[PDB]
């Protein structure tokens, strides 16, 4: 089992570019990894303060008492005991999928395939639900593992009739916003969603789709939206 | 006076001046100024006309 | 049987196995009769599957990928050396199965130029000179660099092989998993039957 950490070229991953361009190796390697994580560290106010407070406690030494109490509470597992648990899990159980989990796997992947990922990608999700079943030592993999697996897969692989409504928003925004004009995310919420011309999910998906189709660019954490192309 | 600023504020914040379609739609002169701020340096007027029309 | 559709490709495989007819002339010339097939498109989409069937079915099928030129020697324990045969030479009156054809070297390409056109290999090495018959039918698979085939353009820009090399293939087919969900469900059900 291989856990690979790679530093993207140009130092920082540019969201304007396809993942292939922010990468220096063979493209076929992208077809090898089951999952990839393009983590981002965009600057923010309240999240930084919460993270910063966490760091200060660690150097304070409070984290030692906090973790031990959390271990006493059971919310945290000892590193040796967890390793003993993992070793026990590996040797003893070997789950297998259930028809309910598989049927949802096919249906969701069909929607992914139609919107666009290869046939191989769906079978990679089969490993994740097996892995979660292994942790629970359940005799069979369950659909409730797939939901997180799909979410993890979406939050990993997609780093960079409702479709008709989403594409209609694309059609409508191409008329509302000429090429080269700028607006804000909340402005679209007040003008298109508060007027109920389109749903907020359609707003989210259309903006997600338009950026990948080089139509628009999202700037300043949504405070500015600029139409880059047709 | 802030001669330039007052015009821009009146164009944006019409409710600070004005006290059955009247109850809903603001005057076009102030509303059109919103697109002007969002517009680029050079404007294809046909696209601007369509963009203005979509908001009505 | 594991591939749904691709009737022309399956017909092409049958025709390539049947082959043509060679001829001889009073001037001493000879005419090629065999047929070659080339496959292009997305890597994992049905190319390794089709090649697996043909390689397993054909009686004289040889698998190749990127010493096939048969112009190199191997030495004994006492020092004396002997040439080793190559897949193109060994596949005389047979078929050559190539995977990762795009990955083969330029040395292979210049040698296979005479193989596909003149059905012979003209070996010219230091102290060794001979001509070996290479009357072999060729079926090969290749993939674009980006992984996703640009259907709007020929393989001369999607794969960038020389036109002289590409012109030596009698038949060329491009396949890519353009998705029809109800149709892909039909073929994937048998795959799901194995899970």
Q: How far apart are CA C80 and CA C133, in angstroms?
A: 25
C29 is in an annotated binding site: no
Does A194 touch chain B if contact means CB atoms closer than 8 Å? no
Phi, psi of C100 (to 5 degrees): 55, 45
| Tokens read off for C41 | 């498109």
Cα atoms found within 13 Å of the Cα of residue C131, Cβ hemisphere only: 6
Cα atoms found within 13 Å of the Cα of residue A57, Cβ hemisphere only: 12
> With an 8 Å Cβ cutoff, are C195 and A114 in contact?
no
| Tokens read off for A145 | 């593992």
> Which 3-state string (H, E, C) describes chain B?
CCHHHHHHHHHHCHHHCCCCHHHCCCCHHHHHHHHHHHCCCCCCHHHHHHHHHHHC
Interface partners of chain C (CB pairs < 8 Å, 3 or more) are A
CA dihedral C111, C113, C115, C121 (to 10 degrees): -40
Place of tokens 């009146």: B10
C44 is in an annotated binding site: yes
Q: How far apart are CA C168 and CA C112, in angstroms?
A: 10
| Structure determined by | cryo-EM
Q: How far apart are CA A230 and CA A214, in angstroms?
A: 8
C46 is in an annotated binding site: yes
Q: How far apart are CA A199 and CA A126, in angstroms?
A: 33
Which of chain A's residues have a Cβ under 8 Å away from the Cβ of B47? 178-179
| Tokens read off for B22 | 């009247």
CA C185 from chain center: how many Å? 31
Which of chain B's residues have a Cβ under 8 Å away from the Cβ of A183? 38
Whether residue A156 contacts residue A110, with contact meaning beta carbons closer than 8 Å, is answered with no
Does A177 touch chain B if contact means CB atoms closer than 8 Å? yes
Spatial CA neighbour of C140 closest among C157, C160, C165: C165
Q: How far apart are CA C136 and CA C62, in angstroms?
A: 10
- Three-state DSSP class for residue A144: helix
Edge-first strand listing for the sheet containing C95-99: C61-65, C95-99, C137-142, C37-41, C171-175
| Tokens read off for A33 | 């990894």
Q: Which residues, at least 6 apart from C99, have a Cβ–Cβ distance to it below 8 Å?
A: C47, C48, C51, C63, C64, C65, C140, C141
Resolution (A): 3.4
């Amino acid at each position: 089992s291989v856990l690979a950490a790679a530093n993207p070229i140009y130092g920082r991953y540019d969201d304007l570019k396809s993942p292939g361009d922010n990468i220096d190796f063979q493209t076929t390697i992208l077809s090898a990894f089951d999952m990839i994580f393009i983590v981002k560290d965009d600057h923010n106010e309240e999240r930084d303060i919460s993270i910063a407070n966490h760091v200060i406690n660690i150097h304070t030494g409070n984290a030692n008492a906090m973790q031990n109490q959390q271990e006493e509470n059971g919310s945290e597992i000892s590193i040796e005991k967890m390793k003993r648990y993992i070793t026990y899990c590996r040797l003893k159980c070997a789950p297998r999928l259930s028809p309910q989990a598989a049927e949802k796997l096919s249906s969701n992947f069909v929607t992914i395939r139609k919107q666009l990922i290869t046939i191989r990608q769906l079978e990679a999700i089969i490993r994740i639900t097996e892995s979660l079943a292994k942790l629970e030592l359940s005799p069979i993999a369950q659909e409730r593992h797939v939901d997180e697996a799909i979410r993890l897969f979406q939050a990993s692989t997609m780093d960079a009739t409702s479709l008709s409504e989403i594409r209609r928003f694309e059609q409508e925004l191409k008329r509302r916003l000429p090429i080269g004009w700028s607006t804000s995310y909340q402005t679209l919420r007040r003008e298109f969603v508060d007027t109920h011309r389109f749903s907020q999910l359609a707003l989210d998906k259309a903006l997600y789709a338009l950026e990948k189709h080089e139509t628009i660019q999202l700037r300043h954490q949504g405070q500015n939206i600029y139409r880059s192309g047709v | 006076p802030s001669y330039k600023s007052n015009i821009e504020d009146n164009l944006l914040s019409w409710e600070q001046v004005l006290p059955d379609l009247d109850k809903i739609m603001a005057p076009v002169l102030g509303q059109l100024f919103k697109l002007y701020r969002e517009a680029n340096m050079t404007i294809n007027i046909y696209d601007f006309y369509i963009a203005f029309r979509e908001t009505l | 049987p594991s591939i749904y559709g691709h009737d022309h490709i399956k017909k092409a495989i049958l025709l390539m196995l049947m082959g043509g007819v060679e001829k001889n002339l009073e001037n001493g010339s000879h005419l090629r009769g065999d047929i070659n097939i080339l496959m292009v498109g997305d890597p994992s989409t049905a190319k390794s599957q089709l090649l697996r069937f043909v390689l397993n079915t054909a009686s004289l099928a040889i698998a190749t990928t990127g010493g096939l030129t048969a112009a190199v020697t191997t030495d004994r324990e006492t020092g004396e050396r002997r040439l080793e045969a190559g897949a193109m030479v060994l596949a005389d009156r047979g078929v050559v199965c190539i995977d990762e054809f795009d990955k083969m070297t330029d040395v292979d390409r210049v040698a296979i130029h005479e193989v596909m056109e003149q059905q012979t290999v003209t070996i010219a090495k230091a102290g060794i000179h001979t001509t070996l018959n290479a009357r072999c039918s060729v079926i090969a698979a290749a993939n674009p660099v980006f992984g996703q085939y640009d259907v709007n353009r020929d393989p001369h820009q999607n794969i960038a092989l020389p036109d002289s090399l590409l012109s030596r293939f009698d038949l060329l087919f491009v396949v890519t998993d353009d998705i029809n969900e109800i149709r892909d469900r039909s073929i994937s059900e048998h795959v799901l039957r194995t899970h």
